[PDB]
Amino acid sequence: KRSKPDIKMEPSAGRPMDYQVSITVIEARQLVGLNMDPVVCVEVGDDKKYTSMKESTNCPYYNEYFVFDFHVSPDVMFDKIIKISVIHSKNLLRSGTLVGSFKMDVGTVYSQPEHQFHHKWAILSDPDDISAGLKGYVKCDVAVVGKGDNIKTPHKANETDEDDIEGNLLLPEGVPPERQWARFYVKIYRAEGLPRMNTDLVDPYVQVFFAGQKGKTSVQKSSYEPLWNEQVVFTDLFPPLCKRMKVQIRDSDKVNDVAIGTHFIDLRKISNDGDKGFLPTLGPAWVNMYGSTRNYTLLDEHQDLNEGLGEGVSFRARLMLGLAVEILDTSNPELTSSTEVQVEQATPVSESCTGRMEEFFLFGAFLEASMIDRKNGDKPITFEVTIGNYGNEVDGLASVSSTPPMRPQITDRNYFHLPYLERKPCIYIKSWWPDQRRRLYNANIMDHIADKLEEGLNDVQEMIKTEKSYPERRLRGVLEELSCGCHRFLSLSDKDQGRSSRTRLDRERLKSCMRELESMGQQAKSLRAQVKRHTVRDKLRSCQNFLQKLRFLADEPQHSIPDVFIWMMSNNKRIAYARVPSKDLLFSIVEEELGKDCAKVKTLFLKLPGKRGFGSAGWTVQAKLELYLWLGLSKQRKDFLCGLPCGFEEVKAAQGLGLHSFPPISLVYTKKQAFQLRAHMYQARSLFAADSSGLSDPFARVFFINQSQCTEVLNETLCPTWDQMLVFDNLELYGEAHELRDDPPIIVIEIYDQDSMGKADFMGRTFAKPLVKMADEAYCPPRFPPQLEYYQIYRGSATAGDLLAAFELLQIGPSGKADLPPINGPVDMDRGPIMPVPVGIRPVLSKYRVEVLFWGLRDLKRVNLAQVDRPRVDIECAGKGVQSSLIHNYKKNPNFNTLVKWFEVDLPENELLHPPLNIRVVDCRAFGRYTLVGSHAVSSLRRFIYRPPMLDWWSKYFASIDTMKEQLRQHEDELKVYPKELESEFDSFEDWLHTFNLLRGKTGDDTEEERIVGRFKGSLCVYKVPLPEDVSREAGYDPTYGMFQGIPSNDPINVLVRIYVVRATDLHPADINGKADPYIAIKLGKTDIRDKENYISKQLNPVFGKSFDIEASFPMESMLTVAVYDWDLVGTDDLIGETKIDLENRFYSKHRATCGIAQTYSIHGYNIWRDPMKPSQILTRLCKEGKVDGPHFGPHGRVRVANRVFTGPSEIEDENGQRKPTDEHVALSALRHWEDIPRVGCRLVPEHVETRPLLNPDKPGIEQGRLELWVDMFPMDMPAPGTPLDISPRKKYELRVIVWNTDEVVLEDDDFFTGEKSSDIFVRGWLKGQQEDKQDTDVHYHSLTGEGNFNWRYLFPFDYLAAEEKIVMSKKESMFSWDETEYKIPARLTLQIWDADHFSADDFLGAIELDLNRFPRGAKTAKQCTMEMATGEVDVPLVSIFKQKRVKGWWPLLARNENDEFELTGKVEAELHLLTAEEAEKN
Ligand SMILES: [Ca+2]
Ligand SMILES: [Ca+2]
Ligand SMILES: [Ca+2]
Ligand SMILES: [Ca+2]
Ligand SMILES: [Ca+2]
C-alpha cells in the first residue's frame, strides 16, 4: 500500500504552545558558609523566585513548589535555562553572597524517559570561581510538561527511603559526575550578503548566547560584507547541559538595535561523549542564516523570524564560523581564575580551508501554477526564485528570477489558476558557493536511507492498519535493505579523502558516523532474525529507535549552499513562500548520492510567511506549484533537462539566441496528450463539525491541474454518502507514458460545510494520486477497477476524518473516447449529471440487521439553556435505522420502557469498509419541534459484529504490599493489591454494557469535555443472517428481547455503597510549605459527605483507615466521586485530588464487581467477611443470573460448578476457639477459579485495595498522588450487612536502664588546688531526640581512676511497631507550628559520659549509639571489657532485647578522637530492661 502522499501545511516546528515546568527543592545538604542564611533561588529564563529564609542551618529543608508557565515554541522552550542557586544573607539593601549555583536546561529535562528527574541532587558548583571546590548539593524534583502529554509519576518518598546523593545525581545518562571545566571558543571570521536596514547601510556585530551567558564582538561600521576576525570564549562545566548555542548577527543602532538573523548550533550534532567520542568542534566553515524578507518595512511583523522564532522565509546572511573547546587545568597558577565571557582577536584563516569559491547553476521550470488564493489574484502575479542573494533583482549571462506577469483566470469561487498551458516559464540562476558538496552528499545519502526506512515503516504500519498478510516478512526485507544501504554508505562516503578543504568537524563526524552506522547495520542484521508477528509492535519501536537517530545523522551543522526560495508577488508585493533544501537539489552521478528533489517535477504548496501561516489564516493554500528544479555545477550541466517531461522546445532570451547551452527563458510544449479524471467519491466519515448543532453540511471540492468540481451537498451528517463521481472532461498533460505512470499528478481534495448563505466553512483537505492508464494497456485485474481507499483528511495540524475515493486518470486513445471503459449509467436517473459510483468500484452490499440494546442515558446537559425532559434516540447506519421508545420523565427514570429493537440495512461485505453507526439523542417536546441533544458517530463495528465462538487487618495489608513490591521489583492471609484503576485490568466491565460518549458542538482545535452533553448506555449487535440453530438459539429463546438474552433487569433498585479509604502516599502538597491536612470527601448523587471532623494534620502520607456508608438509588445514583481535601485554618479549603469511579458497569458486570472475594474465609478476627451473604449464596446467585448449573455439594471439601470440581479446607475457627465444619472455603475457591467455566467463564475481582491515581482538572493526564481505596455495593432489597471492617490505624513499651558503676574513664580535668588528674563522671542518655528523652544521673565528683557510683534508673515510654521495627511518635516540628507531625525512625539509644561543671555546660567525654535489636553483648567483668566488643569485629555476637528482656553487662563508651577510630575512654556497667505499658505500672 502507501499510495497516499503525506503533505501537511503545519509541521511540528514553529507553532507556539503552552509548557510548564515544576521545580521543587526538598533538602539542601553539605553547604559551606560561616553562620550562613541560605535561600534557594529558582530561575527559568528571565524570571526567578526565592524560597523562605533559614537561619544558621547547614542543612536546610524547604520542600517548596514552583511552577513556571509559558506559551512559546518548543525549540525556544528547550533553549531556556534552569538555574538553582543558594544565596547567603539575601536582602534588598545589600546583595547577598553567592554560595553556589547550578545550570541546566529545559530540553534535556524533556529528554528524560519520564520528562522529569525524580529525587535528584543538583551539584551546586561555583560558576564565579573555577578553582573553587564543591559548595554542596540540593535535592530536587524537576518536571517539564506541555498540553497533550500523559506521564507516570514515580514514588515521591520521604527520608525513610533511599536518598543518597551520589547514586541519584542530577545528571543525564553517561555524564561524568565531576564535570571538568572547559573553554568554548567561537571564532567569528567574516560575513557576506547583508541586506539594507538604514533606509541603506548596516553596522553588524555578532552576539552569541550560551548557557545564560552572552558575548558580542566589535561593530564593523558601514559594511555589507564585514570582517570581524574575533573569538568569543566562555567557560562552563563540560559536558554542557545546555544543548544549543544561539549565534546572532545584529544591526547596531543608537535607539533600537534589531536582528539580522539567528542560527542555533546544536551541540549534539557536533559532539560525541565517552572514550570513543570526540570533543566539540566545528568549522571554519560558512553557515547560512535565514529570517524575514530582505526589503525593509518600518513595522515588520515578521521580526521574530530574525530571532530564530520560526522558519526563515528568505535568505538573509552567510556567516563564517568556527568553534573549538578545550579542557583546562584549573589548578594551574599560570592562568587567571576568572569566568566571565571574553572577546579576543582570532587567528586569521585562509579561504582555501573552507573550500574554493566556485560557480553553481540553478534551473527551474514552472509547469503548473494553480489554486492561487482568490483574495490576492485580481492582479497579475510572478514567481521570484532566489538562492542566496542571487536572483534578488527586485531589491537590488544575465540571470533571470521572475516569471512574466499575466492575469490569473477563474477556476472556481475559491481559487484562481494560471493559464501557462503549453508556455511554461523558466528561471536560471548563476551562483558562487564553496566546494563543500561532499558534506551535502553525505547528508543526502543519510536522508536517502532514512527516507527509504521511513517509507518502509509507514508501509508496514499501513499493512498493520489494513491487516494484510505477514508484515513480519516486510519488516525483514526492510531491515535487510537498510543493512544493504548502510554498507553502501560505508563503501561510498569515504573516497574523497584527498581534499584539504575538510575542517576539523568533517573527519570526526565522518568517523563517528562510520562507527555509529556500522553499529546500526550490525544491529539491524541481528534484529532481522528476531522479528516475529506476535511481538511485532515493540520491534516497530526498535526501528523507530533507528530512524530518528538516523535523522540525527542527516542534520548537518555546517551546511554550505543555502536553501532555495520560491516566492509569489502580485504588483511586486510579496504573498507566499516555499523553501526547498539544496541537499535535495544537488546533481551527482551516484543515485543514492543524488538529491531526491533533483531533476524531477515535484508538487510544492506555498504558504503565508511566519505568523500568518498558522491558524485560520492558513487554511486555504496560496499556490500549488509543479516545479522542476535542478542545482549543481556548470560543468555538470550537460543533462539538467533530462528529468523533464519530453515534448518541450526551448525559447531563450535575446542574449542566448543561437547559443548551444544557453538556458531557456521559457518552454513550449507540443506533445500534448488528452486525459480524463473519474473522481470517484463514495463516502466520508468522522468529519469536522462546523455548525453550532454539532453536525455539518459536507460537500467536497476536487482540484486537479486547472479543473475543479464539487460533489453535491448532503445535510446534517458527519459521515456523508455522496455516491457521486466528478468527471473532469478533456484534461491536457505534457510528456510521455513512462514519465507519468510511476509518478501520477496530484489531486487535492478539500471538504467544506455549506451554510445558509453562499459561504462555506472549512473541514481540511487530503491528497491523492490517481490510478493512471494508457491507451495500449487494458483494464486487467488486480490493478483495475480501482478500489476505494481511505484518505486521511487534516484540518491543518489536527486530523479531521477519513475519505472514500478511487481516483483514476484515463488517457483517451486513437479512437477518442471509444477507448474509454464502459461507464455504468445512473440507476437513479432523476439525478441527471450526478452519476453514481459504478459497479466493481462501489462496495457490494449485503443484508445486515442491527439490534440495539437501549439501556439508559446519563447526565445530559441543557439544550439552549433548557433542561431535557423526554429524550428519544434516532439511529442511522447507511441512511436507515430504528428509533428508540420514549421515556416518560428523565428526573425519575432515565431508562427506556423497552430495550431491544432492530432494523435492516445494507452494509459492505468486508468489515474494514463499514460506514460508522450514528446515534443521535433528540428531545421529543410538544408540537414536533425536535432539536438535537447529542450525537455519537465515530465507532468501528468490528467489536459489535457477532461471530460464533496479635494480628490485625493491617498485617494482611502488609503481607500483600510486600508481595506486590516483590512482584513489581522482579518485573522491573493476603489480598490482591492492584496498582492502577481496576478498569484497566478488567476492561472497564464492558461485557455487554457499553458507554458511547455523546457529543454536541464544534470539534475542538488548537476540548472533548466541553463537547460532552451526556453519554448513551447500551449495546449493538450487527449480523448478516440468522445462522444455524445452535448459534441462533441465543436470539431464538426470546425474540422479544432479541439477541441480548441473558440481560438483567432494568427497573430501579436501591443500594448502599461502603467506601474504605485505607491510606494514600505521594501527595502533591496543597499548602506551599510542602505539607497537607487530608480528609476524605465523597459525593454520589444527592449525597455528599465531607469528613472534616476526623482529619489528619501535617501529613503527605496519610494512614486513614476510614469506612463510609452512602445511600444510593440506582440507576440515577451511580456516579461516585472520591476526593481528598486539605484543611485550612482561614479562608476556603483547597482540594488536593479527585477521582471518578462509575458504578453502572461495576454492578451490571458478570465479573461481580460489587464486592471483592477474599483469599479464605474466617468468621472471626482480621479476615472477617464483610458481605452479608455467604459465598454459597453468592455463587447460587451468580449461577442463577448467568445460566449455570450449580452449586453442588458432597463432603465439605469439594464443590462442583458446571462440569468441574474444586477443592478446599473443611474446618474453620471462631472467636471462641472451637472448630466448626463448613464448605464455604471450597465455594470461595470456586469463586477464585470461576474462569474455567466453558461457557460463562470470565474473571472475577478478588478482595482488594486499588491504588487509584487522583487527578485534577487543572492538570489533565498528571497524577497528583495515589489513593488506596476500595468500594463495596450492597443492594438494600437483600438483607443488610453488619459492622464494617476495623481498618482503623494503630503497642506501647517501656525501656529502662540502670548504670551501676564506671571504670577507666579518662581524667580530663586537672585539679585547680592540688594538681592531680580527676573526672566528675556522670551519665546521660536518650532515644528519640532533645525534648522528650533527655535524662541524666547524679555526679560522682573527683574520681581517681575512673571509678564512679550512680545506681540511677532511666525510663523511656514510647509507641512502637514491629512490622518495620519503627518507633512511632508525633511532635511539633517547630515552636511556631499549629500542631504535631508524625515521624518514624528505627529503635535507637545514645548513651554519653560527660564531665560536670558548676558554672557552664558539661564537657563531652564519651558516647555510644546502639540499636536495641542488634547491640553486641556485654562483658562479665570490667577488666574483661576490651576494644573488640565495641568495634566492627565479627567475633562478638549480638543480642536482641525484644527476645531477651534482661541484660546485664559492662560496655565501653568511645570518644570522638581525630584518628577516625574508637579509643577506650570509659566503661559502664549497665542493666537494661524491657517492659510493656501495663507491666510498667507495677514492675
Ligand atoms: Ca457553518
Ligand atoms: Ca452549515
Ligand atoms: Ca491550603
Ligand atoms: Ca492546609
Ligand atoms: Ca568538671
Side-chain angles (χ1 to χ4, degrees), residues 543-562:
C543 279
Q544 173 84 350
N545 296 134
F546 284 171
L547 175 62
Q548 57 185 6
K549 144 78 51 184
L550 202 46
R551 304 301 180 151
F552 180 81
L553 263 65
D555 187 2
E556 170 161 317
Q558 37 174 357
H559 31 62
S560 182
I561 301 159

mmCIF file of all heavy atoms in Angstrom, residues 543-562:
data_model
loop_
_atom_site.group_PDB
_atom_site.id
_atom_site.type_symbol
_atom_site.label_atom_id
_atom_site.label_comp_id
_atom_site.label_asym_id
_atom_site.label_seq_id
_atom_site.Cartn_x
_atom_site.Cartn_y
_atom_site.Cartn_z
ATOM 1 N N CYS A 543 12.695 -0.084 15.455
ATOM 2 C CA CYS A 543 13.001 0.524 14.169
ATOM 3 C C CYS A 543 12.939 2.038 14.266
ATOM 4 O O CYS A 543 13.759 2.735 13.654
ATOM 5 C CB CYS A 543 12.042 0.004 13.102
ATOM 6 S SG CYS A 543 12.489 -1.613 12.428
ATOM 7 N N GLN A 544 12.023 2.556 15.095
ATOM 8 C CA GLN A 544 11.966 3.994 15.325
ATOM 9 C C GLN A 544 13.215 4.461 16.057
ATOM 10 O O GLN A 544 13.751 5.536 15.759
ATOM 11 C CB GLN A 544 10.697 4.348 16.103
ATOM 12 C CG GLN A 544 10.591 5.801 16.551
ATOM 13 C CD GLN A 544 10.037 6.720 15.471
ATOM 14 O OE1 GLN A 544 9.894 6.331 14.312
ATOM 15 N NE2 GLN A 544 9.721 7.952 15.855
ATOM 16 N N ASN A 545 13.755 3.602 16.935
ATOM 17 C CA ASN A 545 14.991 3.919 17.642
ATOM 18 C C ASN A 545 16.174 3.943 16.686
ATOM 19 O O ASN A 545 17.217 4.535 16.989
ATOM 20 C CB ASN A 545 15.224 2.911 18.766
ATOM 21 C CG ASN A 545 14.147 2.969 19.830
ATOM 22 O OD1 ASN A 545 13.626 1.940 20.262
ATOM 23 N ND2 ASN A 545 13.803 4.178 20.257
ATOM 24 N N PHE A 546 16.034 3.302 15.526
ATOM 25 C CA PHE A 546 16.964 3.567 14.440
ATOM 26 C C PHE A 546 16.691 4.938 13.839
ATOM 27 O O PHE A 546 17.535 5.843 13.910
ATOM 28 C CB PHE A 546 16.837 2.478 13.373
ATOM 29 C CG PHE A 546 17.480 1.168 13.744
ATOM 30 C CD1 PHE A 546 17.275 0.046 12.958
ATOM 31 C CD2 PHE A 546 18.270 1.050 14.880
ATOM 32 C CE1 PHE A 546 17.853 -1.166 13.288
ATOM 33 C CE2 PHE A 546 18.852 -0.159 15.214
ATOM 34 C CZ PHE A 546 18.642 -1.268 14.417
ATOM 35 N N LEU A 547 15.454 5.132 13.361
ATOM 36 C CA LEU A 547 15.160 6.078 12.287
ATOM 37 C C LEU A 547 15.388 7.520 12.709
ATOM 38 O O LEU A 547 16.042 8.280 11.982
ATOM 39 C CB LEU A 547 13.719 5.887 11.819
ATOM 40 C CG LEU A 547 13.190 6.871 10.780
ATOM 41 C CD1 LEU A 547 13.995 6.774 9.503
ATOM 42 C CD2 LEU A 547 11.719 6.615 10.521
ATOM 43 N N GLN A 548 14.892 7.895 13.895
ATOM 44 C CA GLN A 548 15.059 9.261 14.379
ATOM 45 C C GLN A 548 16.531 9.593 14.589
ATOM 46 O O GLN A 548 16.976 10.692 14.235
ATOM 47 C CB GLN A 548 14.248 9.479 15.663
ATOM 48 C CG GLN A 548 14.553 8.526 16.815
ATOM 49 C CD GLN A 548 13.630 8.714 18.001
ATOM 50 O OE1 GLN A 548 12.673 9.486 17.943
ATOM 51 N NE2 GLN A 548 13.911 8.003 19.086
ATOM 52 N N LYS A 549 17.322 8.618 15.060
ATOM 53 C CA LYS A 549 18.741 8.880 15.257
ATOM 54 C C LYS A 549 19.443 8.962 13.908
ATOM 55 O O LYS A 549 20.420 9.709 13.765
ATOM 56 C CB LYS A 549 19.341 7.812 16.185
ATOM 57 C CG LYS A 549 20.765 7.336 15.908
ATOM 58 C CD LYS A 549 21.817 8.332 16.408
ATOM 59 C CE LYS A 549 21.581 8.719 17.865
ATOM 60 N NZ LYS A 549 22.538 9.752 18.352
ATOM 61 N N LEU A 550 18.895 8.278 12.895
ATOM 62 C CA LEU A 550 19.382 8.437 11.529
ATOM 63 C C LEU A 550 19.154 9.860 11.039
ATOM 64 O O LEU A 550 20.028 10.443 10.383
ATOM 65 C CB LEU A 550 18.700 7.425 10.608
ATOM 66 C CG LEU A 550 19.394 7.050 9.298
ATOM 67 C CD1 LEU A 550 20.865 6.766 9.528
ATOM 68 C CD2 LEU A 550 18.718 5.838 8.688
ATOM 69 N N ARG A 551 18.011 10.457 11.408
ATOM 70 C CA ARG A 551 17.783 11.867 11.110
ATOM 71 C C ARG A 551 18.759 12.743 11.876
ATOM 72 O O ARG A 551 19.194 13.783 11.365
ATOM 73 C CB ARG A 551 16.344 12.255 11.451
ATOM 74 C CG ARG A 551 15.297 11.408 10.757
ATOM 75 C CD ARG A 551 15.431 11.496 9.251
ATOM 76 N NE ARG A 551 14.425 10.694 8.568
ATOM 77 C CZ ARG A 551 13.929 10.971 7.371
ATOM 78 N NH1 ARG A 551 14.271 12.068 6.718
ATOM 79 N NH2 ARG A 551 13.072 10.122 6.815
ATOM 80 N N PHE A 552 19.154 12.293 13.072
ATOM 81 C CA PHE A 552 20.184 12.970 13.850
ATOM 82 C C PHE A 552 21.520 12.943 13.124
ATOM 83 O O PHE A 552 22.342 13.853 13.284
ATOM 84 C CB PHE A 552 20.293 12.307 15.222
ATOM 85 C CG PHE A 552 21.323 12.919 16.115
ATOM 86 C CD1 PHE A 552 21.033 14.069 16.826
ATOM 87 C CD2 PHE A 552 22.570 12.329 16.273
ATOM 88 C CE1 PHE A 552 21.971 14.636 17.653
ATOM 89 C CE2 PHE A 552 23.514 12.892 17.102
ATOM 90 C CZ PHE A 552 23.212 14.046 17.794
ATOM 91 N N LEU A 553 21.755 11.905 12.320
ATOM 92 C CA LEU A 553 22.936 11.900 11.472
ATOM 93 C C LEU A 553 22.772 12.878 10.317
ATOM 94 O O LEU A 553 23.722 13.574 9.944
ATOM 95 C CB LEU A 553 23.204 10.488 10.950
ATOM 96 C CG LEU A 553 24.231 9.626 11.690
ATOM 97 C CD1 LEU A 553 23.779 9.307 13.107
ATOM 98 C CD2 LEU A 553 24.515 8.349 10.914
ATOM 99 N N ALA A 554 21.557 12.976 9.769
ATOM 100 C CA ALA A 554 21.378 13.661 8.492
ATOM 101 C C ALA A 554 21.403 15.175 8.654
ATOM 102 O O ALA A 554 21.625 15.902 7.679
ATOM 103 C CB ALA A 554 20.075 13.212 7.836
ATOM 104 N N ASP A 555 21.182 15.669 9.869
ATOM 105 C CA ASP A 555 21.166 17.107 10.113
ATOM 106 C C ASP A 555 22.607 17.604 10.136
ATOM 107 O O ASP A 555 23.386 17.240 11.022
ATOM 108 C CB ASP A 555 20.448 17.402 11.428
ATOM 109 C CG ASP A 555 20.243 18.898 11.690
ATOM 110 O OD1 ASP A 555 20.621 19.750 10.857
ATOM 111 O OD2 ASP A 555 19.632 19.220 12.730
ATOM 112 N N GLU A 556 22.957 18.436 9.170
ATOM 113 C CA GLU A 556 24.320 18.936 9.059
ATOM 114 C C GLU A 556 24.447 20.280 9.770
ATOM 115 O O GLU A 556 23.672 21.199 9.489
ATOM 116 C CB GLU A 556 24.714 19.077 7.596
ATOM 117 C CG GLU A 556 26.020 19.805 7.372
ATOM 118 C CD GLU A 556 26.602 19.522 6.008
ATOM 119 O OE1 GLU A 556 26.586 18.345 5.592
ATOM 120 O OE2 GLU A 556 27.064 20.475 5.349
ATOM 121 N N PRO A 557 25.392 20.427 10.701
ATOM 122 C CA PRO A 557 25.583 21.714 11.378
ATOM 123 C C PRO A 557 26.436 22.707 10.606
ATOM 124 O O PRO A 557 26.579 23.850 11.055
ATOM 125 C CB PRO A 557 26.280 21.301 12.678
ATOM 126 C CG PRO A 557 27.090 20.117 12.277
ATOM 127 C CD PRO A 557 26.291 19.387 11.231
ATOM 128 N N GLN A 558 27.005 22.311 9.471
ATOM 129 C CA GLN A 558 27.924 23.139 8.694
ATOM 130 C C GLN A 558 27.508 23.168 7.229
ATOM 131 O O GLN A 558 28.306 22.901 6.327
ATOM 132 C CB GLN A 558 29.359 22.646 8.847
ATOM 133 C CG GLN A 558 29.499 21.138 8.918
ATOM 134 C CD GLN A 558 30.946 20.694 8.926
ATOM 135 O OE1 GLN A 558 31.859 21.512 8.825
ATOM 136 N NE2 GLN A 558 31.163 19.390 9.041
ATOM 137 N N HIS A 559 26.229 23.468 6.990
ATOM 138 C CA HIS A 559 25.665 23.497 5.644
ATOM 139 C C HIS A 559 26.321 24.573 4.787
ATOM 140 O O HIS A 559 26.561 25.692 5.242
ATOM 141 C CB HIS A 559 24.160 23.746 5.725
ATOM 142 C CG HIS A 559 23.755 24.590 6.894
ATOM 143 N ND1 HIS A 559 24.185 25.889 7.056
ATOM 144 C CD2 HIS A 559 22.961 24.322 7.956
ATOM 145 C CE1 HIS A 559 23.674 26.384 8.169
ATOM 146 N NE2 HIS A 559 22.927 25.453 8.734
ATOM 147 N N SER A 560 26.614 24.220 3.535
ATOM 148 C CA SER A 560 27.351 25.100 2.635
ATOM 149 C C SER A 560 26.431 25.947 1.763
ATOM 150 O O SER A 560 26.460 27.178 1.835
ATOM 151 C CB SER A 560 28.289 24.268 1.754
ATOM 152 O OG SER A 560 29.046 25.099 0.893
ATOM 153 N N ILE A 561 25.608 25.305 0.941
ATOM 154 C CA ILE A 561 24.746 26.012 -0.002
ATOM 155 C C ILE A 561 23.407 26.294 0.668
ATOM 156 O O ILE A 561 22.777 25.369 1.201
ATOM 157 C CB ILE A 561 24.571 25.211 -1.301
ATOM 158 C CG1 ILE A 561 25.931 24.968 -1.954
ATOM 159 C CG2 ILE A 561 23.652 25.940 -2.265
ATOM 160 C CD1 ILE A 561 25.946 23.811 -2.920
ATOM 161 N N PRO A 562 22.951 27.543 0.687
ATOM 162 C CA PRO A 562 21.674 27.857 1.336
ATOM 163 C C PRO A 562 20.485 27.327 0.552
ATOM 164 O O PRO A 562 20.572 27.027 -0.640
ATOM 165 C CB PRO A 562 21.664 29.387 1.380
ATOM 166 C CG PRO A 562 22.581 29.807 0.293
ATOM 167 C CD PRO A 562 23.634 28.749 0.190
#
